[PDB]
Write a protein that binds this DNA or RNA. Sequence first.
DNA 1: GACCACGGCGCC
DNA 2: AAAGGGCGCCGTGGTC
Length: 539
Amino acid sequence: LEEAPWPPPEGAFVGFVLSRKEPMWADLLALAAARGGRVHRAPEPYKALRDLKEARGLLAKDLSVLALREGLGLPPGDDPMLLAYLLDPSNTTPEGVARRYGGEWTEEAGERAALSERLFANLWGRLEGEERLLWLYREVERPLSAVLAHMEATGVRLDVAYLRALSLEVAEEIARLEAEVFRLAGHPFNLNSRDQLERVLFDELGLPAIGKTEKTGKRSTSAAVLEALREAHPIVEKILQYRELTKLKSTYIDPLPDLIHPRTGRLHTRFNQTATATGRLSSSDPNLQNIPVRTPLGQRIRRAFIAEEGWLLVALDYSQIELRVLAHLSGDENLIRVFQEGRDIHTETASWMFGVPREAVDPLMRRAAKTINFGVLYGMSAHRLSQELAIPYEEAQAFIERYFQSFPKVRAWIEKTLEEGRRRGYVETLFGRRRYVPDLEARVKSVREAAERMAFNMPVQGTAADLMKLAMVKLFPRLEEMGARMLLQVHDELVLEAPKERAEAVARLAKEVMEGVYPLAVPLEVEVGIGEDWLSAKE
DNA sequence: GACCACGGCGCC
DNA sequence: AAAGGGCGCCGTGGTC
Ligand SMILES: Nc1ccn([C@H]2CC[C@@H](COP(=O)(O)OP(=O)(O)OP(=O)(O)O)O2)c(=O)n1
Ligand SMILES: [Mg+2]
Ligand SMILES: [Mn+2]
């Protein structure tokens, strides 16, 4: 290009280089911004941030978070990554976008800046006429990048000392199981090694191999596999317990405390805006969208996430979100009436499994019905359902036949979605967010049908993601007026942090904002709870 | 040290 | 395991 003197002109496309991928832990190595025929490089990166008024370019949110870390108000402007992601959800990284639309993602701030300008021109040029994508960009994604920036920079408080002592506790319980797995095995080995375990269970012990692995075709030792052999030998019962514990200790209990930022005393996740194929968000380093909740030990980990002194956590989750979305998208008179009568499909389905009244269904029994109702909905097999519920295959198939018979309009939408998908080559959400499926007309029955399940799942899951995103955009400005913070987003759940005084008012406000974000043919009811910790905030 | 494929699994 | 979908992270085992 051409060397220009810092600062750059108003609205120059910025390019930056970090020491590591986490903006909260990264050192701003280099900083530059591209203008028409100029490069505008910076001498000192941290001082150069003071000159900028807006971050426009590739990964705009990342630099914004780093600036927001240094107490700087540097909002996220245009981001070509957002443009490419809307053009195609496949475009997830700058490395994949640049080579597709003329350019090369490098490690130079100036060349990264230059790319951001030219990539903008191509992508914004290809976004002409796509008013459904433009509306989804200007009114949702582009504002959301600002909200996510404040969320990542804020972070969530974690009870360090609690998890520390909890680690030593789980440790002794792991050694007990491990010692109780060795004796039955007759010898010691690596329980973490599925290879060594496979030999012990199937070659040494007389246990039957029930499943194979995908890539290598080895005898599987998965949970579902061991679940079937839970009475074939007592060692299997203990392995499942060992699996659960080491899983929680190696993923959450141990890593999370060492992820606390020294200057904030909080946990800072990354909300990837262009990572999923359905339009969902993504949480990484650390993943705060997969904090355990199912098991008792998992709930103990959940309580480690607490509010700041004098503050309270406020959790809001859309009740039966995709089922309501499905009711709006399909227009099933029976399904719409279900919610209009204030029914709970998860509760009734759990009432059928355990053979108990709807009132006898506890919060843990109902949750187990989610994977079944959602499973069956998106093409689960009667075989798989039979084994999970420990019921005969004849009883499992009867559920599916009865499940889709309660609502004789959903399948009309499913085939409609697939047919429209085979014609256009892509399925779209309620707002217009499209996903290109290239195997709807595949010749292989496996490849074709697998692409089909991805095809009609995208509009329902994607719509829910769209509604949540739009809700966050409408809700966030209201938070700053009441001194409230937006902490986490869990697909259909929002975790807020408000002062103890107005914590009640925030919950009532946030609930109403989320319920009326986009009125459908079905009411979008939201369950809200206030607690001193995350687990308490959902009870 | 940085990276990779794989099985496995936590959540939504 | 399998005809549920969407993620990220873990240890193992391995390469460079
Ligand atoms: N095993 C699962 C669980 C969830 N989901 C999707 C469906 C909706 C979305 C979030 O829904 P949840 O909050 O997990 O459950 P729900 O349907 O919203 O019901 P509730 O809010 O009462 O738990 O994630 C899924 O596809 N598969
Ligand atoms: Mg939820
Ligand atoms: Mn929900």
